Design a protein around this nucleic acid. Sequence first.
RNA 1: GGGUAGAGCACUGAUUGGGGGUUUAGGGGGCGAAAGCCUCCGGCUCCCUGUCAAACUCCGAACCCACUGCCGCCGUAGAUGGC
RNA 2: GUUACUCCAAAGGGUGUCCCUGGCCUUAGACAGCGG
RNA 3: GGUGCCCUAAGGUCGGCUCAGGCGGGUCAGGAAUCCGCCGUAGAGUGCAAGGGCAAAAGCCGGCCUGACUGGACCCGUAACA
RNA 4: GGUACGGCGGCCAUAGCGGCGGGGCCACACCCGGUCUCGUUUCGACCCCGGAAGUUAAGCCCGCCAGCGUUCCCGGGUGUACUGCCCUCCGAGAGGGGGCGGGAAACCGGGAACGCCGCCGGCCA
Lengths: 96, 166, 171, 164
Amino acid sequence: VKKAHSFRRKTRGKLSKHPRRRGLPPLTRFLQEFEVGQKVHIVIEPSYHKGMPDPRFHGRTGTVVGKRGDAYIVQITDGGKVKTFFIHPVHLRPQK
Amino acid sequence: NREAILADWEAHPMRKPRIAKVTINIGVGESGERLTKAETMLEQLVGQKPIRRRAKQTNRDFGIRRGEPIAVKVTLRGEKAYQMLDRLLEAVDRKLKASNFDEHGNFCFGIQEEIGIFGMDVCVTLERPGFRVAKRKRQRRKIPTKHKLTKEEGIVFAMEELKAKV
Amino acid sequence: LRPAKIDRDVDKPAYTRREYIRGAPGPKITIFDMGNLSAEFEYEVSLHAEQAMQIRQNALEAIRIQVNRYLQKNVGRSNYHFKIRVYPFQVLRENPMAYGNGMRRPFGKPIGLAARVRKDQKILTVWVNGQHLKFALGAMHRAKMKLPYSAYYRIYDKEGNDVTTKVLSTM
Amino acid sequence: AHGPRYRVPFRRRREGKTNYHKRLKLLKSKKPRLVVRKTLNHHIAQIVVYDPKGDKTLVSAHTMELMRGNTPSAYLLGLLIGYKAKQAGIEEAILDIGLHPPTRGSSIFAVLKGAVDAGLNVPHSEEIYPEDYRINGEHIANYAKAKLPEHFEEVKAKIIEKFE
RNA sequence: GGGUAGAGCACUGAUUGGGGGUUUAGGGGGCGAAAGCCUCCGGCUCCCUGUCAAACUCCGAACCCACUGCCGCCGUAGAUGGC
RNA sequence: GUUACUCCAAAGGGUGUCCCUGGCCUUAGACAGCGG
RNA sequence: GGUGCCCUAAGGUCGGCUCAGGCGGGUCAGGAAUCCGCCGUAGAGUGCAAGGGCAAAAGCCGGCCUGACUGGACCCGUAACA
RNA sequence: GGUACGGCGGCCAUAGCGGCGGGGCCACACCCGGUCUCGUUUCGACCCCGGAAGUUAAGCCCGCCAGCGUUCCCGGGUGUACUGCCCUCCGAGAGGGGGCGGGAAACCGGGAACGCCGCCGGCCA
């Protein structure tokens, strides 16, 4: 039986947490700041459902190109295409 | 017994117990769905406004319309508790027993008796003063075993208050 | 029933979970400990699998009956603590085909149960004293006969060390 | 703490001193914070700015600094803090309340009113302020007949002369 | 960034037996002058002991993916790319 | 037997022969035999 | 293994509170539920399947409301890469 | 430069749970009572309000304990189990083996560990 892709298909592990986190993250993540051109890792936090990208791109590294609202604009290169996302800083982590 | 409570009072009096509160329930229950005046019975004999207590899962005896008056209880504090006990303790048996007291030193009575119908359930719960931190909002915490209450401290407090014991 | 060479090997995924398998059967084996259970014997004679294997509960029960009757007729209930260590958890299935639809919708219905064993794994044990090692070895042989693959027996002492050669030399 | 699956809460939450949800909502703003705590016998207040290694305090005020725990003392605390802040070079702020519930007519909001009157911009709607007959003392004085307003106004004029 | 192989029982579910207890919701009962205080086969509670998992995990590889820098190779005798 | 694979029969047995190891008896041992 | 719905609240926000079960007391045919205290990392509950999330809560108890609105942009998925 | 004092935080169990002994200028608490703001679908029990008769028994602070639990180090288990690439290697088959590279988990023994850091105050001389 062929099954279409959806937001939460095969996410049992990818969007779980070690039972010792089990709650709100420390607040230095919600209050991050990045600059245009900075490289960021995409690391989804499963307790915040706002500003969350397709989990297919969990584990990738992109670059910041701008800002809209409280969300940052992140560009990735999927194969030979550029894709643009508006992601909340709680799902991001800087490279070095 | 006396050993313990008197030695601990010699230490300091903040270890001395008291009556946290006196709760008078009508547990066996008789209301059903009517305003049977047990409300007024307890009201007149206590001295303030009563409260009901709604029901739970479907059953047989009473409490089958989940939400309906099924009982009446009142929680007295202050002097009023000492007062009501100064006649209820007299009413029912002297030499307060040992199976009245549970693992922690609070005890209960199961007395039962135009409307004069009532089967009551009394219970005194005791404590020392500094137990309000486990119920406070700020900096809440639990009580150690040192400042916690035992059984024979209850027995001696009860004898001295107004009774003998078995 | 169907030959055991169909179920011998272990090349299929594990199929041991009953909250999802519809119509699974109960076991035909209920006794795994026989004899004297609180008697602190000296020698422990244990069977060992030579390669990975899948044993049917039928074979297990036959082994049990034969070995226990032998040990009773020869040694005596007061001795010989006899134990089977493995339980049947695998579920075996057969395709309901043989009018028929052949290989259309082939997914077997459950028929039986089996225990999985890996290489150099213990299957059963006889705890006995010196004067009955002959009969313990006899039981080893009888059980060896009724198995799909081959197996080897070893002997152990208190502290569980191998004294098999020393005990085999001196009879 | 009972095994490998037991989550141990934050230290301040174990202690019973910080609400992190409200902390987040307040930090979402980049304006600074006006903290006001209250004890059985005293008040304290200060002005705080955020840093990821630890909050930094710029100003403070204590009822000891005053008398060198009620609505008049809180109003004078607000007076002091509002007069002190306008020096340091900050004219903006938002209130923080912690684990104190908001009740219409409390000394926390008395501090808010004092600081406002001192002239520090703090957004608010005048429906929670306590009554001025409570700020005065009429409450305690008229209790005493079954810190007179005189000395209240004395301290008032003192503080206002000092920070004119 | 990940949860496969392996391993293991810390959760969900299964699975042998021997001990120490509450003794019980409960059928046979027995000194039951009749739910009864005493046992009695049974459940539940800790210590051993022997076993499991495609739809379990307190653990956890080899390996794969994205990004930065360097080596190597391609490229002004024209790269990426675009029509 | 003279078969890399494509494209070769087992459980169970053998004082058949060639080897390794570990115990027990020996200068009167392990069979047969004069003699219970 | 489930869906072809339901809901003026089961929608928005503010405040306050903490669950299942077990044990010890008191009712009692088990006690189905009402009263008391203690232990208790969630062993509960969530409008409905499964998985994931959630505790001064996203759960329970209450108050006030209709952002279940109008005019418009950009981006992701169904349908990786294409 | 002191104090066995306090507010706000960051790393979020090496910090927890449990226990043992010590302390009270200021302070933090327990505590008395409810007219008044606020409030108890009964109860000033919990929150709110006015104080301080009183106490260091609880909370808080100083120090200690490896008892439960968590984290880290060394040694063994052991280069064991598993694994990437090549093979006219073995074996009836199932499945194993060799060379070059990677490499656990349980369990066992011995060690550390009963929090670290930043800002601002008050009392004091």
